[PDB]
Amino acid sequence: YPTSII
Amino acid sequence: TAVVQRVEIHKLRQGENLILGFSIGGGIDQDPSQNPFSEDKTDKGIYVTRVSEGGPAEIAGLQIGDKIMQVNGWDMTMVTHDQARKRLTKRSEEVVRLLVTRQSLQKAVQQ
């Protein structure tokens, strides 16, 4: 489950 | 049940970037069964997976597990992960208004 930091 | 929250985030300059201070998971190209926050494990929507202490998102009231319905009015219910990420990080936009739904509970069932 990839997550992206923003 | 899901309660609607409208959150207004003012991006914080950190060097070259304007940051929101949270992380997202989800999107139509990702495996929804791997989302620990959804009620429906076929829900391919965009979810907040982490929120940074003292960041713009935390201060604005965004919470881990929130489902992002809209960003400045772009639908986020049927976008790819990257599409979601791009809508959130448009450098020209310093204010981002999010429409989210939040899994919530009737508190004080007893008192």
End-to-end CA distance of chain B: 21
- Minimum distance, in Å, between the CA of residue B20 and any CA atom of chain A: 6
d(CA B42, CA B3): 20
Residue keyed to tokens 């929101």? B20
Q: Are strands B67-71 and B12-14 parallel, antiparallel or unpaired?
A: unpaired
Which residues are registered as beta bridge partners of B97?
A: B8
Q: Domains in chain B and their CATH numbers? A: 1-111 (2.30.42.10)
User: Left (φ > 0), alpha (ψ -120 to 50) or beta: where does B35 sit?
Assistant: beta
Q: Which residues contact B17 (CB under 8 A, 6 or more apart)?
A: B91
Q: Is B88 on the interface with A (CB under 8 A)?
A: yes
Strand partners, B47: B25, B67
Q: Mutation test of the interface with chain B: which of A1, A5, A6, choosing the one with the most B Cβ atoms within 10 A?
A: A6
